[PDB]
Structure formats: C-alpha cells, structure tokens
Design an enzyme around this catalytic site. Structure first.
Site, PDB file in Angstrom:
ATOM      1  N   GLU A   1       0.817  -1.210   0.000  1.00  0.00           N
ATOM      2  CA  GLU A   1       0.000   0.000   0.000  1.00  0.00           C
ATOM      3  C   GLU A   1       0.853   1.263   0.000  1.00  0.00           C
ATOM      4  OE1 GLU A   1      -3.150  -0.228  -0.424  1.00  0.00           O
ATOM      5  OE2 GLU A   1      -3.520  -2.341   0.030  1.00  0.00           O
TER       6      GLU A   1
ATOM      7  N   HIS B   1     -13.908 -12.498 -13.759  1.00  0.00           N
ATOM      8  CA  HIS B   1     -13.585 -11.503 -14.774  1.00  0.00           C
ATOM      9  C   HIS B   1     -14.074 -11.892 -16.161  1.00  0.00           C
ATOM     10  CE1 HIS B   1     -10.622 -11.877 -11.551  1.00  0.00           C
ATOM     11  NE2 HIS B   1     -10.479 -10.565 -11.580  1.00  0.00           N
TER      12      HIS B   1
END
Ligand SMILES: *[C@@H]1O[C@H](CO)[C@@H](O)[C@H](O)[C@H]1NC(C)=O
Ligand SMILES: *[C@@H]1O[C@H](CO)[C@@H](O)[C@H](O)[C@H]1NC(C)=O
Ligand SMILES: *[C@@H]1O[C@H](CO)[C@@H](O)[C@H](O)[C@H]1NC(C)=O
Ligand SMILES: *[C@@H]1O[C@H](CO)[C@@H](O)[C@H](O)[C@H]1NC(C)=O
Ligand SMILES: *[C@@H]1O[C@H](CO)[C@@H](O)[C@H](O)[C@H]1NC(C)=O
Ligand SMILES: [Zn+2]
Lengths: 198, 596
Positions: free
Chosen positions: B357, B487
C-alpha cells in the site's frame, strides 16, 4: 522592521536587493505594498526572472526589482467546506503583462479564427476561474497570503526613515554625545538661559 | 492561430476543470467505503451523475482536433486517450441490451445457490461456501459435488447470454475499427511514432508464447511432483502419467494453488519463518507497522509521508455501529490528498500488505506533476509491479532481523529455502499457464477461429494438453465454464496478470546489482542503496508521458518482456525439483480419464 524580522510566524520572508537587518534604517521616498492570495505552490513563482501563469498573466516582477516578499499559509481562513470560490485568477490574455501592471477585464478569448461574440463555447472560453479551496487540500494547494513591499527613492526628502534608538543621558562629566544629529564632546550642565519656543 | 495551440488551450482548460469535479467524487467514494449508510448513497449517484455527465461532453467536443496536424508527441498521446468514444458509438437500441446483459451476468454471478441433490435442507452458495470447503476436504464426492453444481447452474443459465455477449462486443469493437474485440483489448499495449519503442498489436501473442515455452520444464516437473505427492493423500483415481483432476487443484478453477501446501511439504517437521509471535509478544500498535513501512521508503530512496495521510486515513477496523468495508486500497483523491483504506490486525500478512500500500501511495504521488490525463501507470500492469517488489524485500530474513522481529540468533537452514520457494511458486508460477490459456480462448472466440458449437470441447482439451487437467465428469456442450468466472462474467481482461508476473522480477534483478548484493536472488534485499532508489524514482516519475517500453528499458535495459529473471529466481527450486523427480516419469498423457 521589527515585528516582521523577529516574529517567526512567517513561512517565507525574503528580501532581494537589501538585507533584513543592517539596511533596515535606510529610507526612501515611498513604500508600496501589493497584497493578494494564491495557492501554496504558486509562491515559488513570485521572483524576478520567473515564468508561468502567475508570474506573467497575473503579475509580472521586474528583473531589477528591489524590495521584500512575505508569504504565509492561510488555510485556517481561506478554506471552506463548500469551497472557496471567492478568489479569481486569469488564464486567457493575448499579451504578457508589464511589471506592476494589472488587467481585470472579462473578455472571452478569441482562441479560434471566428469572433466569439461574448459567449463561451467551442474555441471560446471564460478567462477567470476560481481555486475552490477546501479544508482537506494539501499544502501544495492550500491558500497562502503573499505581500510584496517595494521601496521608491527619488530626488525627494524621503520622509519615512524608521525608528531611532536612544540612550539615557548623564551630566557633570565630559562625554561624547549625538544630540539629534549633532555630534559633540564635553560637559553637559544645567543652565538658565531663555530659549524661544522654536 | 493554428489548431495546435487551440488544442493546447482546450487541453489546459480540461485539465483545470476535471480536477475539482473529480475531488468531490473521490471524497464521496472514501466516505462510502469508510462509512456505509443509506444516506451516503445519493452522493455516489450525485457524483456518479455530475462527473460522469461532464466526461461525455468532454468527448463530444474533443473530436474536432485532428491528430494529423499536430507534431508534438505528448499532446498526440493525450488526444488519443480523450478522442475515444467508448460505448456511444453504439446506437441506443443496441446499447440497451449490452448493459442488460452486463446487469444479468453480474446479478447471476453474485447470486449463488449450490445445494446437494435430494436434500433441500442445507445450501452454502459462494461465500462462506464453495471457496472455504473445497480447499480443505479429502472427500472425492464432496470436492466434485460443488464443482459440478456451480457449473450446472451458472454455466447453463449464462451460456446463451455469453453467445450474444461475444458477438455484441465484437460489433462494438469493430465499430471502433481495431479488427474486433481481441484487438480492442490488445491495443492497450500500443505504442506508435517512436523509433526503437513502437510495438504492434499482433506481436503480443507470439511474444507471450516465447516466454511461455521457456518455463515448460519447470511446469512439467512441478506437475509430476504434485501428482506424486497427492497420490499419497488420495490413494488412487490418479493417472501414473496424465492430467490431474480439476477438483484437486486448490480453488474451483485451478487458478490458484495455495491450498496444496498442506499435503505437499518438501521437508517436514520444520516450521517456517514466523515473526507474528514477536509482534504480539512486545505489542506493537497498528501504527508502527506502517511507520516501519514508512521508514523503509524513507531510507532507500524516497521522501517521507505528508501530514494528510496521518489524519485522513482509517487504519484499524472501527467495528461499533459505523460499518467499514475492509478492502486494502490506496486512495489518491487529488489536490495533494493521499490515504489508505484497510483494517489491520497484528499479522505478518498485514506487515507485507502495508509495504504494498505504501508503494502504491508513493507511486501515485510520483506522477503528480504530470497533467491530469497522464496521471496513471504505463499500462494496467506496471502499477502492481511497483509496490509488489517491496514484499520481495520485506520478506527476506535480513530486514526482519534488522528491525528486531526475527530472533537475531537464528540460523537459516538449507531446508527452509526450498519450502519457501515452493510455497510462493504455487501462487505465481502455478497460475500463468491457466490464465494465458483462458486469455487465448477468449481471443480465439472473439477473433473468429472457433464457431459457437465447438467451444467447451476445445476448452476442455486445452484443459488437457496445456494445463494438464482432466474432466472429473464428461461435460456436454450445454454449460459454459468460462461464464462462471469472475472476470469473464463481468467485463474484465486477463492479460494484465501475465506481463505483471514478469515485470515484478525484471525490475528487481536490476536493483539487485544496484544494491551490491551477494547471494541467491530470493534473498535480494535493497537497503542503504540510494542509487537503487534513484533509479526507481527515475522510472516512477515518468508515467504515461513516455512509452511503457522506455520505462521498462530505463531499469532493465530491454525493449521487450523477458522471462529470464523469473527463472533466475528459481535455480535452487529447479535443482531440488529435478532432484526428487528421477524415479517417476515427468509430463502428462492426455488420454487417461476418471470416467475412462
Ligand atoms: C456515518 O454515517 C451516518 C449516517 O447514517 C452518521 O450518522 C455517522 O455520524 C457517520 N459516522 C462518521 C464517523 O462520520
Ligand atoms: C510538447 O508539449 C509539452 C507540454 O507542454 C511541452 O512541454 C513541450 O515543449 C512540447 N514539445 C515541444 C517540442 O515544444
Ligand atoms: C520527514 O523528513 C524530514 C527530513 O527532511 C523531517 O524534517 C520531517 O520531520 C519528517 N516528517 C515526518 C512526518 O516524519
Ligand atoms: C542499513 O541496513 C541495515 C540492515 O539491512 C538496517 O538495519 C539499517 O536501518 C539500514 N540503514 C538505514 C539508514 O536504514
Ligand atoms: C544444504 O547442505 C547440505 C549438506 O551438504 C546439502 O546436502 C544440501 O544440498 C544443501 N542445500 C541445498 C538446497 O543444496
Ligand atoms: Zn497492490
């Protein structure tokens, strides 16, 4: 020039052509102050020999400028939850500005080859827009109050000459003295002559 | 004035006008994803109106600036991005069915219901259902049960809609004149007009096959290894030389193999590296993990964080009455606003995720000086290739020792290295063939090689000859296994998972020379090398103002993707794998079957 130099509440305080102290007791005919508010990252552009929107189409600084510049954060005043749309600034101007020149027109830029006829649209846009400052913005976009001080000297009396320091006086002992620009040496003694009121 | 400066003026106006509009949308998004409530849903809609509407108008008036009369490369790249139509080239009548099919697919994929036959009492759906159970279960029928039920429901109820979706996407792409939908997606990697850096849309397939062929010995060796080691837990139903079943490969689709280390351990009786015990004994707070993630970037080559991230980002799960969705993400709201949305416990996984992150945050601010439309990674894969290499350097048993978590008197044995290599190769190495095979199936479906009838048969026999997966039950041409995918049911691509896999290793080896490091590649930890940080900065700050090939070459020195770093990561694992595969034949035979 003491509530400015001594107080360390200023993010940026830079004098070009003069020192902060030492030269703080030399005087000139006139003092000119220009005050405004810009974004955090534009405070860099305020210098001689600088290019950009602020330095050219909003306010141009001469290369031989002599004076001082102060710039400090104002996020606690110019930040609103709904956005600070009050401050306006320019993009669309046909020519660069001269030093100490201003333009406050609202002419729609004729960017294309056809007359805009005063209405925005394709190749026709408004020249002034707003920051819209917000409390959550970064320091790179936070509002900064900037004031530039310029000193003007001419063949004039130059009647703005700062504070003068003084010392207590002693008597009955010969000393050096500078009485209001009068340099002398000797004993100062109580007298009883009658001087006219002037 | 000429068209060039008018286009420049319009570009500047768009760059100014998009920023303030996007900021409110980002703020609303953070408010929702931090505080879920009914009243904070109009804002989405409100934002999802205004911004969205504005966007379409900025594509309406932007097509009257032809790129032919402009000689500056950067503004040409900018105009290419903003001159795209999207879905407005389709008429309204044909656009009311594409969104309808998208809604149907999303709703049906989110709506799961898997139940055992002749037992309407208990059902378990998707989560906490299928994924949890058939990853730790040694029952043949139970594993093949949800496997068949999910395909029998979703495949049946999505195959006819998939048939229409394929042709609709082909038509909408051909209206944009790429050649079809396959070239529509393969044009993401397009660079033209730059000598030594231009690339063609069709060369992607062959270039991928090139790196695919140079890993097959590793894949075959691990295939034989896992087959032989699962012949122990499951005594039989496995070919001596053949395809492994689809229900014994971890997840439902075989795309992840993390669930197989329990049965397949290289060397037993040896616990792996665990520093979470040290974290919980001396009781770090939720902050010091991020501060060490902060100080790593501070020390290597990068400046420290601003004040805004430390007072506008939620770090710990709030609980209470205020609901927050835990999904660790990096948020770049704009105007110098950066934050992180995640809930942290005292775990080593959170320790590794914090580095990822923080790398994402430092990447987002790196290109903050670029124009608004160039604030993105080189492609859809380099963005994850920047912060993921930190986990490669945050897991070495030298930085943990340095920060005071891993037993400064520890001796790293020859046994743990191969175990770690297999554990992390079950994730990265074990997913490339299936993912690229899925992408190839999508590409040949969209191109036109395979008619709609021989879809699953080709799918199922590619499951045999490429992946090495055999049918636990002979399926007919009434299902649609791809339609039951995340997906594939929802419109997303799969190519980004391949090049990324090779990007994360290509950059690393470069810094491994910049760090003056000696030893195995898996132990390459960048530290106290400002030069490596300088090179990293020299590639992060560019962004989309330069071609992706140039960004790659700036670090690795290659104008094309290479697989050699990935194998340079795996020399000890390759040697150990060939060390214990000398008593059984390697490879698979695509003729064996559980149903014969
Ligand atoms: C979350 O949103 C609700 C609105 O339903 C509000 O009452 C509450 O104060 C919000 N919490 C925070 C921390 O802003
Ligand atoms: C192309 O546009 C960029 C964006 O302002 C500019 O910096 C650059 O100088 C331009 N190219 C040339 C050759 O001037
Ligand atoms: C960031 O580093 C600078 C050193 O250049 C230091 O002065 C500053 O206090 C640091 N800020 C934080 C939040 O650590
Ligand atoms: C240099 O490396 C050691 C061990 O990797 C580490 O403990 C130290 O913090 C590094 N130096 C700096 C300035 O971070
Ligand atoms: C570790 O050392 C032993 C002892 O010589 C050796 O047999 C083994 O191969 C070494 N480990 C590896 C991965 O080679
Ligand atoms: Zn990530």
């Amino acid at each position: 020039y003491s509530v400015l130099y001594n107080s360390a509440s200023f993010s940026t305080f830079k004098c070009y052509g003069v020192s902060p102290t030492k030269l703080n007791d030399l005087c000139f005919t006139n003092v000119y102050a220009d005050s405004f508010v810009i974004r955090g990252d534009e405070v860099r552009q305020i210098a001689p020999g600088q290019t950009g929107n602020i330095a050219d189409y909003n306010y141009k600084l001469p290369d031989d400028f002599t004076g001082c510049v102060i710039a400090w954060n104002s996020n606690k005043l110019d930040s609103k939850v709904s956005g600070n749309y009050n401050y306006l600034y320019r993009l669309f101007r046909k020519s660069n500005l001269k030093p100490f020149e201003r333009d406050i027109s609202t002419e729609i830029y004729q960017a294309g080859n056809k007359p805009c006829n005063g209405v925005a649209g394709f190749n026709c846009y408004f020249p002034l827009r707003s920051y819209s400052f917000r409390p959550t913005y970064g320091v790179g976009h936070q509002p900064y109050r900037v004031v530039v001080l310029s000193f003007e000297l001419l063949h004039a009396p130059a009647t703005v000459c700062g504070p003068k320091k003084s010392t207590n006086l002693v008597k009955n002992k010969c000393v050096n003295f500078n009485f209001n620009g009068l340099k002398g040496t000797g004993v100062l003694t109580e007298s009883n002559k009658k001087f006219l009121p002037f | 004035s000429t068209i060039e400066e008018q286009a420049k003026t319009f570009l500047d106006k768009f760059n100014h006008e998009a920023e303030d509009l996007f900021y409110q949308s980002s703020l609303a998004s953070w408010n929702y994803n931090t505080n879920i409530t009914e009243e904070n849903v109009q804002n989405m809609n409100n934002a999802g109106d205004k911004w969205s509407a504005f966007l379409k108008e900025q594509s309406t008036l932007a097509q009257m600036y032809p790129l032919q009369e402009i000689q500056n490369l950067t503004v040409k790249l900018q105009l290419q991005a903003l001159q795209q139509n999207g879905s407005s080239v389709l008429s309204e009548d044909k656009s009311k069915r594409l969104n309808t099919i998208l809604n149907t697919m999303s709703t049906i994929y989110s709506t799961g219901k898997v139940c055992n036959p002749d037992n309407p009492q208990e059902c378990l759906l998707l989560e906490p259902g299928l994924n949890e159970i058939m990853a730790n279960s040694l029952d043949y029928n139970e594993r093949l049960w949800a496997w068949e039920s999910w395909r029998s429901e979703v495949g049946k109820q999505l195959r006819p809609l998939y048939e229409e979706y394929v042709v609709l996407k082909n038509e909408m792409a051909r209206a944009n004149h790429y050649e079809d939908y396959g070239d529509y997606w393969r044009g993401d990697y397009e660079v033209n007009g730059v000598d030594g850096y231009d690339y063609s849309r069709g060369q992607l397939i062959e270039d991928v096959e090139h790196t695919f062929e140079e890993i097959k010995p590793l894949y075959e060796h691990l295939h034989a290894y896992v087959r032989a080691k699962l012949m122990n837990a499951y005594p039989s139903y496995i070919s001596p030389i053949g395809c492994l079943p689809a229900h014994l490969l971890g997840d439902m689709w075989g795309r992840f193999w993390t669930n197989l280390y329990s049965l397949t351990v290289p060397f037993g009786q040896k616990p792996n590296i665990d520093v979470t015990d040290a974290m919980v004994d001396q009781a770090w707070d939720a902050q010091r993990i991020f501060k060490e993630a902060e100080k790593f970037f501070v020390s290597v080559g990068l400046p420290n964080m601003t004040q805004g991230f430390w007072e506008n980002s939620m770090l710990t799960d709030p609980g209470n009455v205020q609901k927050a969705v835990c999904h660790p993400t990096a948020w770049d709201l704009g105007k110098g606003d950066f934050r992180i949305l995640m809930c942290t416990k005292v775990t080593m996984d959170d320790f590794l995720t914090a580095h990822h992150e923080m790398g994402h945050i430092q990447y987002d601010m790196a290109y903050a000086a670029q124009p608004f439309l160039l604030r993105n990674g080189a492609n859809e894969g380099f963005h994850e290739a920047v912060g993921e290499i930190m986990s490669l350097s945050a897991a070495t048993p030298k930085h943990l020792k340095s920060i005071g978590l891993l037993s400064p008197d520890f001796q790293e044995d020859n046994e743990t290295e191969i175990n770690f290599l297999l554990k992390q190769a079950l994730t990265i190495v074990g997913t490339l063939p299936f993912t690229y095979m899925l992408e190839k199936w999508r590409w040949m479906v969209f191109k036109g090689e395979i008619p709609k009838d021989q879809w699953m048969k080709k799918w199922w026999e590619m499951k045999r000859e490429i992946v090495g997966v055999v049918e636990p039950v002979p399926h007919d041409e009434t299902y649609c296994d791809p339609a039951s995918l995340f997906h594939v049911s929802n419109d997303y691509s799969f190519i980004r998972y391949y090049t990324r896999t090779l990007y994360q290793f290509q950059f690393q080896e470069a810094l491994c020379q910049a760090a003056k490091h000696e030893g195995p590649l898996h132990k390459c930890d960048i530290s106290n090398s400002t030069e490596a940080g300088q090179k990293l900065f020299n590639m992060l700050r560019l962004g989309k103002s330069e071609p992706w090939t140039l960004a790659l070459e700036n670090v690795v020195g290659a104008k094309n993707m290479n697989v050699r770093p990935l194998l340079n990561y795996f020399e000890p694992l390759f040697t150990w794998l060939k060390d214990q595969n000398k008593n059984s034949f390697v490879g698979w035979s695509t003729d064996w079957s559980p149903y014969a």
